[PDB]
């Protein structure tokens, strides 16, 4: 079933079985490893973020940006390999009560327990599709920690339209499409090797 959301309530999160198609039309926040680490330091300590991640959508990515007429223009924002945040993403979900992670490749099986306990979904973005997703960015609202982390590692706050198609690849119901395909692939490979 394909869905289109402007916001994702936990209610809607639990309504996304593996293999569903999603398009987003609202706010998204970018975060790579450096950003995930800084966010965890500051919420564990009681520092106020200038932004709210409660029930939010995180995109694993490094947006290329150009300053044009005293506003930012996106040129390319492809998805980052998500398994780079494998060792910080549990702590991250438990401090922030995010609703969705977007990226590519997937994340380790263990986190599927964390996605069932807290209400969270992982959505695969077309790997390689930097121009398509850039074109979906309607406006750049704000950027955080720019001076400290620099342009790709900074948290960019975006407004997107028809940001997709995204595939539900790990759900809040204990299912991972990566784990499924790898077991079938092992079986068909034995029948050849």
């Amino acid at each position: 079933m394909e869905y289109t959301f402007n916001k994702l309530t936990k209610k809607d999160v639990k309504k996304l079985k593996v293999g569903d198609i999603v398009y987003l039309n609202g706010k998204i926040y970018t975060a790579r490893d450096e950003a995930h680490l800084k966010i965890i330091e500051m919420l564990k300590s009681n520092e106020k973020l200038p932004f709210d991640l409660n029930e939010s959508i995180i995109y694993h990515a490094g947006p290329i940006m150009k300053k044009v007429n005293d506003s930012w223009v996106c040129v390319s924002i492809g998805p980052t390999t998500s398994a780079r945040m494998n060792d910080v993403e549990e702590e991250f979900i438990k401090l922030t009560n995010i609703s969705a992670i977007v990226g590519k490749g997937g994340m380790k099986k263990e986190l599927l327990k964390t996605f069932e306990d807290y209400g969270v979904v992982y959505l695969a973005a077309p790997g390689g599709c930097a121009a398509l997703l850039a074109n979906s960015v309607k406006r750049v609202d704000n950027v955080y920690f720019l001076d400290e982390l620099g342009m790709p590692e900074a948290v960019w706050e975006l407004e997107v339209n028809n940001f997709g198609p995204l595939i539900v690849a790990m759900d809040s119901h204990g299912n991972s499409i990566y784990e499924e395909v790898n077991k079938k692939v092992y079986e068909k490979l034995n029948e050849l090797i």
Partner: protein, 282 residues
């Protein structure tokens, strides 16, 4: 003047996907049955239209800069040395004006060079061609990390033959799964030494989709391997599907009677290249 041609060559490669690869992606889309992989493929085809319209790289990971240089008759070695400098300078300039991401680092320190030039970074492959006359051929081959990180070598026993080759190719594609972003293009190098086998596997990736080995017998092994690879069910992005690979390219060389080296170079759906022939001042 070569540095500015080199810049236009990396812009070509970074933005405009070769037509043989776009066609193969349209065909992949009409041929598969998985709803997930059909959606993934139209997004990719849409990506490529938008990259060209808005003049931005089709893929954010513009890669490590690899350069294949063919050299014609009646060129001084001193002029070839100036051509190699202009190729470096044009990679420095391409990083700036394409733009390319600065991805070349020191392997132990991880210090970024900030121009993709350093420590033999512009990997420049040199060949001589007696059929060119004061004319060079430049291929720009921007290689991504995701696909290069699935490269494999294996020193088979000769008595393993063609069955052990097929088995090593299938094991390697299966192990990689969704990580070099399928659908994919497989380059297989057989023979030489270990370094030659991997050189061949990369060279095999310069070919156009549907371009079979000019030896009909190896052309047949290319199609057996494409059919068996498509049986794996990896599909677009390793999400499940009928099309795992767009094509299989083999290249061979003489090997030691007691050896059989086999190299594999995977390429992601973003097969990127651009070629230009250049007549030199008389």
């Amino acid at each position: 003047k070569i540095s500015d041609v080199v810049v236009e060559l990396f812009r070509e490669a970074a933005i405009y996907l070769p037509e043989d690869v776009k066609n193969a992606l349209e065909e992949a889309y009409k041929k598969e049955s998985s709803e997930i992989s059909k959606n993934t493929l139209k997004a990719i085809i849409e990506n490529n239209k938008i990259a060209e319209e808005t003049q931005v790289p089709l893929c954010q990971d513009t890669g490590v800069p690899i350069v294949f240089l063919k050299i014609g008759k009646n060129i001084n070695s001193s002029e070839i040395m100036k051509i190699i400098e202009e190729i470096k300078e044009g990679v420095k300039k391409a990083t700036e004006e394409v733009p390319l991401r600065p991805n070349v680092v020191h392997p132990l320190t991880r210090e970024n060079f900030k121009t993709n030039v350093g420590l033999n970074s512009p990997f420049i492959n040199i060949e001589f061609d007696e059929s060119l006359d004061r004319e060079i051929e430049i291929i720009a081959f921007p290689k991504g990390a995701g696909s290069e990180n699935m490269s494999a070598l294996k020193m088979l026993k000769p008595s393993d033959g063609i069955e052990g080759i097929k088995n090593f190719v299938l094991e390697t594609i299966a192990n990689a799964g969704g990580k070099p972003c399928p659908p994919i293009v497989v380059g297989i190098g057989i023979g030489g030494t270990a370094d030659v086998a991997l050189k061949l596997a990369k060279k095999a990736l310069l070919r156009k989709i549907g371009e079979r080995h000019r030896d009909k017998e190896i052309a047949n092994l290319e199609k057996e391997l494409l059919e068996k690879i498509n049986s794996l069910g990896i599909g677009a992005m390793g999400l499940g599907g009928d099309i795992t690979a767009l094509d299989v390219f083999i290249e061979i060389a003489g090997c030691h009677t007691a050896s059989l080296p086999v190299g594999i170079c995977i390429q992601c759906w973003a097969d990127r290249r651009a070629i230009k022939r250049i007549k030199l001042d008389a």
